[PDB]
Enzyme design. Structure first.
Site, PDB file in Angstrom:
ATOM      1  N   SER B 118       0.850  -1.185   0.000  1.00  0.00           N
ATOM      2  CA  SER B 118       0.000   0.000   0.000  1.00  0.00           C
ATOM      3  C   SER B 118       0.888   1.238   0.000  1.00  0.00           C
ATOM      4  O   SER B 118       1.717   1.409   0.900  1.00  0.00           O
ATOM      5  CB  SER B 118      -0.933   0.007   1.214  1.00  0.00           C
ATOM      6  OG  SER B 118      -1.542   1.272   1.399  1.00  0.00           O
ATOM      7  N   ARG B 119       0.712   2.096  -1.007  1.00  0.00           N
ATOM      8  CA  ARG B 119       1.583   3.257  -1.153  1.00  0.00           C
ATOM      9  C   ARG B 119       1.359   4.291  -0.058  1.00  0.00           C
ATOM     10  O   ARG B 119       2.294   5.008   0.311  1.00  0.00           O
ATOM     11  CB  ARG B 119       1.407   3.869  -2.543  1.00  0.00           C
ATOM     12  CG  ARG B 119       1.858   2.930  -3.664  1.00  0.00           C
ATOM     13  CD  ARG B 119       1.278   3.269  -5.030  1.00  0.00           C
ATOM     14  NE  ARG B 119       0.507   2.162  -5.582  1.00  0.00           N
ATOM     15  CZ  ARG B 119       0.418   1.887  -6.876  1.00  0.00           C
ATOM     16  NH1 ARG B 119       1.061   2.609  -7.783  1.00  0.00           N
ATOM     17  NH2 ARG B 119      -0.317   0.853  -7.270  1.00  0.00           N
TER      18      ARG B 119
END
Lengths: 101, 256, 230, 284, 115, 85, 115
Positions: B118-119
Site C-alpha cells: 500500500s503506497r
C-alpha cells in the site's frame, strides 16, 4: 616444567606445560617428572593422571597409543578405539566380505 | 465501499457494448473500459473541510469527509498481464495480493508480501502500529531470502538460523480465523510480543495457543491499558513499560 | 518559454499513459489495430510529441519523462517506440535506497549516449568508464566476500574494495529540497568538481581519509574538510 | 509449448536456481570446516614420522618388510572417492589417472589390487571389473580412522605376507581453496624421506619392551595415519569441487531464464495480435 | 467448514492438503537432488505424502468393468480415521501399494499383511 | 472438437517415433472409452497390467535417471517396464 | 523402406536417428549441470552423436567460392559403411574435428593424422 602434548589422528586431546604425569606404560605405571630422560613405549588403555603446572591435577582417558619423552618436550600419540589383533581382524574381514558384495 | 467483482462489471459492459454494435477492442472490451473503472474508483477520496462547508451550505463546518474503496478483481492462473487487472492496478493506491499456493499451504489469509503493498503506508497507521510494524516487514523479507536454506538443512549456519527461526515464527504469527477481527490493542500487543523477543522460545504449534492465551490473560487482568490503546493508539515509554510488565507476567505465570 | 530565449525543462509524468490514451481514442473512432493491439499511428504520434522537444537557435527544451514498461517487456511496441527517442536513461533502485544513499540512482544501469570522447571529452569519458569498472569489479568481489569472507582478497583487491566504497559514498548529495529531513544545507556540484573528485579517489589520492568523510558532503574539498574532525 | 506452460517452466527453473545458490554457500562453509579438520591431522603424523626417522635412519636400522625395497610382482592401490554426486569430474579424473598407472604395471605382468573408500569408486570399478578385495562406504561428511582400519589391515596383511611388493594411496590434493589435483603416492614400502638429524645421540629412547616391537607398531600407525590424512583432504576437495560446480549451475540456470523469457514474451505478443485480428475481422 | 463437518474431519482434510503442497514443492528439485541431497525432514514428509496420495485411489462399482476388482465403499468416519491414521499413527510399516485401491483402513493393513 | 466427439484417442508422437519406438503410440495419453469390454477375455487378463505398467515405467524412468539412483523393487520394476516397452 | 533400400540402408538410418534423438534428450541436463553428471555410457552416446553430427557435413563443388576447400562426391556404398562403423564405434578413436567437412571415412582418419 615440561611441554606435553596428548594428540590423536583426528583431534589434539590436550597440550601445555606440566609438572608431572602418571601413565600406564606397557610394563607398568610410570611417573614423568620434570626434565626426564628419553623414553619410548606403548601405553595401555585407561585413565592417565595429569598434574598441569601450578598443580592442577586431572584425569584423561586414553584408548591406548604410544608415549615418547625427551628433555624439553614430551608427547603421547593416542589411539581412538581399543586396538587388538582380534578387533582389527574383525574389521578387516568386514571389509573383505563387503568387497565380495 | 466494497465492489465485489469489478471484473464482472467489465464483462457486463463488454457484453452491452458488443450488443450495441460499438467497435470492439483488446480482448473484445470497448476502448473506454479503463475510463469506466477510472471514473468509478476515483470517486473514492477524502475531501477537506472547505469543500464540505461549501457543499452543505454551512450546516457542517469543521469536518473532512471521505469515501474509501476496496475493489475486488479476479485473475486467471495468477496472470496480472490481463487487460482489466493491469488497468485497475494502474488506477488504485496499492494492492493486497492473495496467493492460492499460500492458501493451500495453510497460510490464511494468504497475503503475499513484497508483491502486495500500500503506497499510503505509514501515514494511515496509528502511532503504535507504525512503530511496531517496521520490524515485521524486514523480518519477513529476510525470511524470504533464507527460505531457500530451510528445506536443505540449516545446520551449517548460526546467526541465519536465528533470523530464520524469528522469520518462521512471525510467518506463523499472522494467520487468523475468518470471523475474528482484532482491535488495535490486541494486534499491537501480539506484535510487541513477537518483535521484542518474547516468542523466541515458543514452538510453532504452541504459538497459536500462545496468542489465544495471551489475549485471554490481558482481557482478564489488564483491561485499562487495552482501553487506552484502543482509544488513543499512542506509544510512550510508559506504555512500553506497561507492555513489558504484562508480557513478563504472562511468561512467568500462565500456561499456553 | 523557449521562444523567449530560455532553456526549459518539461517533465512528463508518464509517457506510457499518452500512448494508451492514443490507443483508446483510435479504438473509439474504429481504426484497425496494429502490432500488439496498439493504434496504427503509434510511431507517428510519438514522433509528433518528441520532435518538438529540441534545442533551437534561440533556446531549448530538455525533457525528463517517466517510463513504465508493460509486463516488464522491453520488446513491447510502447517501450520499443519510446526508446528510439531517449538520449539518457536514469534507473532508480530500491536496493541503493536501502543503503541510505540518496539519490537512489543506480550507476551501473543508468546510461547516456552522450558518453563519448567525441562529444564529452576524453577526461570525462575515462573517468566515467573508470568508476563503472571499479563498481562492477566491486560487485563481483562482494559476491566473493559473501561466499568466502575477506580473507580471500589480495592487497590489490582490498584497494579496489576500499576505493569502491569511497566512490559509492561520494555519489550521495544533499539537496536544497532535502533540507527538511537532513538539516544539512543543499549543494550544487559543478561538473569539474565531480570529475576531479572521482579522478582523485580512483587514482589513490585521499586513501588516507575515511569513507564516511565522503558521504552526503558535496565537493571533494568539503569531503576532506569534513574528515578533519569526523 | 504454450505460454502458460512456458511460464510454468520459467518458475520451475527459477526455483532450481535459488536452491543451487544455497548449495554453493553451504559447500563453501563445509570446505572451511573440513580444512580445519585437515590441519589437526598433521601434528600426529609428523611427530610420528620424526620418531620413525629417529629409529629407522639411526644406527639401529633394522630390516623390516615394511621398510625394505623389493621387486614388484604385485601392486596395490588404496583409493578414495565420494559417496555423493554433484562434485563434477573429481572422481572421474582420479579414476582415469589410476587406470593409466594400473594399466602400466599390469603390462609388466603385475597383478593389480584395489581397496575402495566411498561408494562411487566401488560402483565404477565394479563396472570396470577391477580387483577389489576390501571396501568401506557411507562415511559421508564425518570420516573416522576406526572405519579405515578394515581395508588398510587387509592390504597390510597382503603386504607383510609378501604377496604385495608396493602399495599406493590414490587421492586428490587440496592445494588451494580454488584448485585441487588428483595424485597417486607410494605409502609402502616406506619412502626414503630425508628426515635427517643427529641430535638423537643426546636423547636415545629406552625401548620398552623391545625396540623392534615398538617400531612395528609405529609403522602400522603411520600407514593408518597417512590414509586418514588422504581421506580428509579428498573430503575437502569434494566440498570445493561441489562449490564450483554449483556456481556454474546457478549461472547456467539464469542464462536459461533469460532465453525462455524471450520465447514467452514473443508468444504473448503474437497471441494478442492473432486474437484481436480474429475479433476485428470477425465483425460485420 | 469446521463448524459443519467438525474438527476431526476439517483438520484431517486440511492437513492432507498442506502435506501435498509441500510435496509438490519438493518434487521438482528432487529431480535435481534425488533423495540423496534432500534432508531427513523431507524424507518423512515425502513418505507420508506418497502413501496418502495412493490412499485416495478407490475402485468403483462402475469401474469393475475396467479393473476386475470389486467396487469398494468407504464411510466418512472411516476415511477420516485412516487419513488421521497416517497423519498421527504414521504406519510406514506398510508398503506403498498397501494404500492403493484398497478402500477401507482395515483392508489397507490387511493388504500389507498379505504382502 | 474431434477429441470431444470420439470414443477414444490414439496419440502418435514424433519423439517416440524418432527413438525407435514404432508404432509410436503414447500409452500415458492414449485412452479407450469402451474399455476391455471390447476385448477377448485372454487379451483382457494380460493387457490390464500392461497399461498401468507402461505409465508407471515412464514416470520412474525420469525420476530415477536424473537422481542417478537405485532401490531394489524400483530396479526390478524399471527393467521390467523397459523390456515390455 | 527395408524393401526399397535394403536392411542395411534402413538399419543404419534408424541407428543414426536413434542416437541423435537421444542426444536431444540429454541436452537439458547438460545445459543445467554440464556433462560430468551424465552416466558413463551417456557420455559415450554424446561423443558418438557429436561425431555423427560432424560427419554429416560435406564440402560442395559449388561452395568452393565460399569455403575454398575442394568438393567431394560420396557414393552410397561408402557413406553407409562410414556411418555403420561410427555407430559400432570402430572409428570412435578419432577426434570430433576430424569428421568436419571430409568426404569419406578415409579422409577423416587422414585428417586426424594431420590433427
Amino acid at each position: 616444567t615440561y611441554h606435553l602434548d596428548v594428540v590423536s589422528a583426528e583431534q589434539q586431546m590436550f597440550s601445555g606445560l606440566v609438572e608431572k604425569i602418571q601413565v600406564t606404560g606397557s610394563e607398568g605405571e610410570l611417573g614423568i617428572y620434570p626434565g626426564h630422560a628419553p623414553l619410548l613405549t606403548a601405553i595401555k588403555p585407561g585413565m592417565i593422571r595429569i598434574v598441569k603446572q601450578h598443580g592442577h591435577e586431572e584425569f584423561i582417558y586414553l584408548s591406548g597409543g604410544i608415549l615418547e619423552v625427551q628433555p624439553g618436550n614430551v608427547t603421547v600419540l593416542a589411539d581412538t578405539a581399543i586396538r587388538g589383533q582380534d578387533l582389527d581382524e574383525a574389521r578387516a574381514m568386514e571389509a573383505k566380505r563387503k568387497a565380495e558384495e | 465501499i466494497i465492489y465485489d467483482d469489478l471484473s464482472k462489471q467489465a464483462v457486463a459492459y463488454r457484453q452491452i457494448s458488443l450488443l450495441l454494435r460499438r467497435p470492439p477492442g483488446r480482448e473484445a472490451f470497448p476502448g473506454d473500459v479503463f475510463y469506466l473503472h477510472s471514473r468509478l474508483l476515483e470517486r473514492a477520496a477524502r475531501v477537506n473541510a472547505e469543500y464540505v462547508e461549501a457543499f452543505t451550505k454551512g450546516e457542517v463546518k469543521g469536518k473532512t469527509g471521505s469515501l474509501t474503496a476496496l475493489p475486488i478483481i479476479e485473475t486467471q492462473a495468477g496472470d496480472v498481464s490481463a487487460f482489466v487487472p493491469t488497468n485497475v492496478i494502474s488506477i488504485t493506491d496499492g494492492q493486497i495480493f492473495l496467493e492460492t499456493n499460500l492458501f493451500n499451504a495453510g497460510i490464511r489469509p494468504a497475503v503475499n508480501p513484497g508483491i502486495s503493498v500500500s503506497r499510503v503506508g505509514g501515514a494511515a497507521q496509528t502511532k503504535i502500529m507504525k512503530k511496531l510494524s517496521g520490524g515485521i516487514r524486514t523480518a519477513l523479507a529476510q525470511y524470504r531470502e533464507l527460505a531457500a536454506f530451510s528445506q536443505f538443512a540449516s545446520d551449517l549456519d548460526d546467526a541465519t538460523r536465528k533470523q530464520l527461526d524469528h522469520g518462521q515464527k512471525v510467518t506463523e504469527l499472522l494467520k487468523q480465523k475468518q470471523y475474528a477481527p482484532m482491535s488495535v490493542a490486541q494486534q499491537s500487543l501480539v506484535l510487541f510480543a513477537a518483535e521484542r523477543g518474547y516468542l523466541a522460545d515458543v514452538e510453532l504449534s504452541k504459538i497459536g495457543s500462545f496468542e489465544a492465551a495471551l489475549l485471554a490473560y490481558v482481557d482478564r487482568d489488564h483491561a485499562p491499558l487495552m482501553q487506552e490503546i484502543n482509544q488513543t493508539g499512542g506509544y510512550n515509554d510508559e506504555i512500553e513499560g506497561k507492555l513489558k510488565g504484562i508480557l513478563d507476567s504472562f511468561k512467568a505465570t500462565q500456561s499456553w | 518559454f523557449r521562444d523567449e530565449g530560455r532553456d526549459v525543462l518539461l517533465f512528463v509524468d508518464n509517457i506510457y499513459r499518452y500512448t494508451l490514451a492514443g490507443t483508446e481514442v483510435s479504438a473509439l473512432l474504429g481504426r484497425m489495430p496494429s502490432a500488439v493491439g496498439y493504434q496504427p499511428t503509434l510511431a507517428e504520434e510519438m514522433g509528433v510529441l518528441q520532435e518538438r522537444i529540441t534545442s533551437t537557435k534561440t533556446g531549448s527544451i530538455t525533457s525528463v519523462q517517466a517510463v513504465y514498461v508493460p509486463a516488464d517487456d522491453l520488446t513491447d511496441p510502447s517501450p520499443a517506440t519510446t526508446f528510439a527517442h531517449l538520449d539518457a536513461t536514469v534507473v532508480l533502485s530500491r536496493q541503493i535506497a536501502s543503503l541510505g544513499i540518496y539519490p537512489a540512482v543506480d550507476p551501473l544501469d543508468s546510461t547516456s549516449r552522450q558518453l563519448d570522447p567525441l562529444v564529452v571529452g576524453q577526461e570525462h569519458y575515462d573517468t566515467a568508464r573508470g568508476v563503472q569498472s571499479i563498481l562492477q569489479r566491486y560487485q563481483e568481489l562482494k559476491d566473493i566476500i559473501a561466499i568466502l569472507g575477506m580473507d580471500e582478497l589480495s592487497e590489490e583487491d582490498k584497494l579496489v574494495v576500499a576505493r569502491a566504497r569511497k566512490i559509492q559514498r561520494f555519489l550521495s548529495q544533499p539537496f536544497f529540497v532535502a533540507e527538511v529531513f537532513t538539516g544539512s544545507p543543499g549543494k550544487y556540484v559543478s561538473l569539474k568538481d565531480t570529475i576531479r573528485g572521482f579522478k582523485g579517489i580512483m587514482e589513490g589520492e585521499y586513501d588516507h581519509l575515511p569513507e564516511q568523510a565522503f558521504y552526503m558532503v558535496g565537493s571533494i574539498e568539503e569531503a576532506v574538510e569534513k574528515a578533519k574532525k569526523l | 509449448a504454450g505460454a502458460k506452460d512456458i511460464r510454468s517452466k520459467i518458475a520451475s527453473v527459477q526455483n532450481t536456481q535459488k536452491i543451487t545458490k544455497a548449495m554453493e554457500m553451504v559447500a563453501a562453509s563445509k570446505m572451511r570446516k573440513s580444512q580445519d579438520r585437515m590441519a589437526a591431522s598433521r601434528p600426529y603424523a609428523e611427530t610420528m614420522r620424526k620418531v620413525i626417522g629417529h629409529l629407522a635412519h639411526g644406527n639401529l636400522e633394522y630390516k623390516h618388510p615394511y621398510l625394505e625395497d623389493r621387486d614388484v610382482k604385485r601392486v596395490g592401490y588404496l583409493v578414495v572417492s565420494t559417496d555423493r554426486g554433484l562434485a563434477g569430474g573429481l572422481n572421474i579424473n582420479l579414476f582415469k589417472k589410476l587406470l593409466a598407472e594400473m594399466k602400466t604395471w599390469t603390462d609388466k605382468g603385475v597383478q593389480a589390487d584395489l581397496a575402495m573408500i566411498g561408494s562411487k569408486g566401488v560402483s565404477f570399478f565394479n563396472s570396470v571389473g577391477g580387483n577389489v578385495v576390501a571396501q568401506v562406504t557411507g562415511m559421508g561428511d564425518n570420516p573416522s580412522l576406526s572405519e579405515l582400519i578394515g581395508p588398510v589391515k587387509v592390504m597390510l596383511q597382503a603386504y607383510d605376507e609378501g604377496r604385495l611388493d608396493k602399495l599406493y594411496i590414490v587421492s586428490n590434493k587440496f592445494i588451494n581453496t580454488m584448485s585441487q589435483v588428483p595424485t597417486i603416492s607410494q605409502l609402502l614400502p616406506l619412502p626414503a624421506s630425508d628426515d635427517d638429524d643427529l641430535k638423537h645421540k643426546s636423547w636415545d629412547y629406552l625401548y620398552e619392551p623391545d625396540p623392534k616391537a615398538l617400531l612395528d607398531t609405529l609403522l602400522r600407525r603411520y600407514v593408518e595415519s597417512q590414509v586418514y590424512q588422504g581421506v580428509v583432504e579428498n573430503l575437502a576437495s569434494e566440498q570445493a569441487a561441489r562449490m564450483v560446480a554449483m556456481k556454474a549451475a546457478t549461472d547456467n540456470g539464469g542464462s536459461l531464464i533469460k532465453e525462455l523469457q524471450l520465447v514467452y514474451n514473443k508468444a504473448r505478443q503474437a497471441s494478442i495480435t492473432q486474437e484481436l485480428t480474429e475479433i476485428v475481422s470477425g465483425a460485420a
